[PDB]
Design a protein around this nucleic acid. Sequence first.
RNA 1: CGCGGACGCUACGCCGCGACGAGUAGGAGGGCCGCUGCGGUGAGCCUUGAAGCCUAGGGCGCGGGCCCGGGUGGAGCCGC
RNA 2: GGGACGGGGCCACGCGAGCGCACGGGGUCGGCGGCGAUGUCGGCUACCCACCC
RNA 3: GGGAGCGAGACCCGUGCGCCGCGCUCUCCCCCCUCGGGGGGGCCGGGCCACCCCUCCCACGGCGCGACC
RNA 4: CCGGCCGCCGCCGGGCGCAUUUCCACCGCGGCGGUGCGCCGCGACCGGCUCCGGGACGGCUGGGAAGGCCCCGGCGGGGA
Lengths: 44, 50, 50, 216, 19
Amino acid sequence: KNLRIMLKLNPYAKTMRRNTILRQARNHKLRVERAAAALAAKSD
Amino acid sequence: VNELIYKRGYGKINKKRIALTDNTLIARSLGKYNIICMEDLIHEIYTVGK
Amino acid sequence: IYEKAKHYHKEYRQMYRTEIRMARMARKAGNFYVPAEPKLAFVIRIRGIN
Amino acid sequence: KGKPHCSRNPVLVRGIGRYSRSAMYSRKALYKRKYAALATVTKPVGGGTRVVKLRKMPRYYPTEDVPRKLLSHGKKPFSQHVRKLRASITPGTILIILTGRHRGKRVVFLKQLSSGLLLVTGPLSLNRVPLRRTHQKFVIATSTKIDISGVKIPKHLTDAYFKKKKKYEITEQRKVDQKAVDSQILPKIKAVPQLQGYLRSVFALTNGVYPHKLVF
Amino acid sequence: IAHPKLGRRARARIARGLR
RNA sequence: CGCGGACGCUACGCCGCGACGAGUAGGAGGGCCGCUGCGGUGAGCCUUGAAGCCUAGGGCGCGGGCCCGGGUGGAGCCGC
RNA sequence: GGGACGGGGCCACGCGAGCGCACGGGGUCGGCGGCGAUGUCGGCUACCCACCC
RNA sequence: GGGAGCGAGACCCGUGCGCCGCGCUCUCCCCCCUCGGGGGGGCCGGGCCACCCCUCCCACGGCGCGACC
RNA sequence: CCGGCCGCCGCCGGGCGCAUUUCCACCGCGGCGGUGCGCCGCGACCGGCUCCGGGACGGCUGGGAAGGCCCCGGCGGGGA
Ligand SMILES: [Mg+2]
Ligand SMILES: [Mg+2]
Ligand SMILES: [Mg+2]
Ligand SMILES: [Mg+2]
C-alpha cells in the first residue's frame, strides 16, 4: 500500500510503476479512437 | 514470492526474529555471497542459485 | 541496486517468453514441447500438533 | 534573488512525477549552471553605566520536571489541513437539515467555508431560517438545484462572523445581509412552480416509507 | 566502484569532475 | 563581548531486543504475607484515649493480606 | 551508410552555498459546544431486587 | 513508546523540524495566460531503440544433398 | 596519612555607591513554552490493521481448430 518504503528497498520500482501507467493510459485513447473510427464507418 | 517476502518476510539474526526494513540487514549476514539486497535474494529463490 | 534490478527485469521477460516459443515452433511441425520439471515447491502444513 | 519559477515537472499521481531525472537534467539545463568555489545590553544612568542581561535566569525551580517528547512528521494543526466536499453538493442545491432546533427544514445551500462548515441560508420569509452555518455530515442532499451565478455575495462574511463571542439580541447586520441576499435569491425560487410551499414544509417519516427504498 | 578499498580514486576523479 | 549546560547509577541497580506460558503425585526457588518471643535500633507512638472487637465508610495488592476514617472500649503497643 | 524532412527513453551528459513540500526511524489539533447549589453532576467496587447465558 | 538533534567553530555559545530514502524551486535567461499575486512553455549536445537497406557470430527446429562411422 | 608564607578563584560582614539597578504586590479574559479538565459530549486530516465495492489496460490458447454475426458470401457436387 505504501510507496516510499518500496523506494527505500528498491528504487527501480519507481520507473516500473511510471510505466504500466503511461501504457494503461495510452491504450485507452488508442481504443476509443477505434470505436470512433468505426462508428463513423457504421452509418455508411 | 513478492507478496511473501515484502509482507510476511522476517529475518533470523542471532537466533532472534528481526524484520526486513533495509538492505543492510541482509548485507551483514549475506555479504559473503554477493547478495546485497532483496532482489538478488529473489532471483536466487526463483531461479535457484548455488 | 537499481542496476542489478533492471538487469533482472530483462531476464524474466526472456525466461517467460522462451518457454512459449518452443511450443509454437513445435506446433508448426506437429511435435510436442514438454517443458522441464520445476525446481521449487511451496509447502504448507494444515493439520495439528495433536 | 532571482524569480521563483514554477515546478518544472507536473504531477502524475500523488507522489510520482511524470519526468525522470534525465529528461529533468536537460529540462533544467543543468549543463550550464556549474558551481565551483545581543544578550549583553548596556545602559546609561543619569555611579557609572550598567550592563543589563536579556532573558535572565530563573528564581524558582519546581521539584521535578517532565522530559521532552519525540518528533513525528505528519501532524498538522487544524488550520493547515485539506478541505473536501462530497460529490453531489453544488452551490444552489436543496438540502434537508436534520439536527438543530431547525429539525427537518428544506433549505438552500450557498457555499463551502474555509473551515469546512456550510453556509445554509433559508429564505427567512418562508422557512424562518436565516444565514446559518451547518455541517456537511448532517445534511441530506435533495437532488433539486437552482441557478446561483448571478449573485453578489458579500466578502466580509466568514467563520469569524458566525463564531461565538463568550440573554441575546440580534445585531442589525444580520438583518442587513439576510435581507440583501434574500432579495436576490428569492425571485429565482419564486419563478419555479410549486416551490415556495415546498421549501416550507417539513420532512417526516410515516408507515410505508423506508429510506433505502425512495431515492432522494 | 562499490567496495571502498579499490574505487576510492574513482570517486576521487568523480569529485574532480563534479565541480 | 556574557559566566551559562534536564533526568540518572539502592551495580543484589536501571534500560532495550526476541521467542514462549496446560499440568496431578512429586521437586525447587522468591515471599516489603502472617503469629509468639530475644539481642540491636527508631531522641517511635500512648488516659487531648493503646490492644481488642464492630461496620450499607473510603482505597491499594495477581494474591497471602494490610492501611485509613467513623463507633464502642479503658492501659499498655508497633515498624525496620 | 541513412535511406536526402527524423516521436519516445537512457541514475548518460575527496568540503558548492541557502530555502520548502513530504504515503518518510509507533498521534496531533497552534479545533469547538451546551450543563451546573436544596436539586442536581460524578463513584467501576461494597448492599438488596429483576433478566439474558 | 517519549533528550533521535542538527550548526557554528576555539576568529563563536545560538537554537529545539531532526536521520535514512523521494524532488520543489534559487545562485543563467526569453516567451505566454489569469488582476504584486497565481499558472505554464522552453534554454543543447551525444549515444540507442523505432523506420526503410545491406549484414556477419551464436542457440534451437525441420526439409534436401554428400561423406566416414 | 599535614603547618606557614606565597599566587589565582569564590563566598560572608560592615562600609561608600543613592538611579534607565534587583524579587519584592497586584493590575493585562496579553507573547511563548510546559501540565491539564468540574462534568457531558462532537468533529477534522495522517499512520497501522482489515472487510467489501466501482472503473480501466494487457498475456496464453489447435498463434482461443473455438463457435457465432454482417444476399444461401460466390460458383459446383451430392444427401435425408
Ligand atoms: Mg485428533
Ligand atoms: Mg504453566
Ligand atoms: Mg455485615
Ligand atoms: Mg484497669
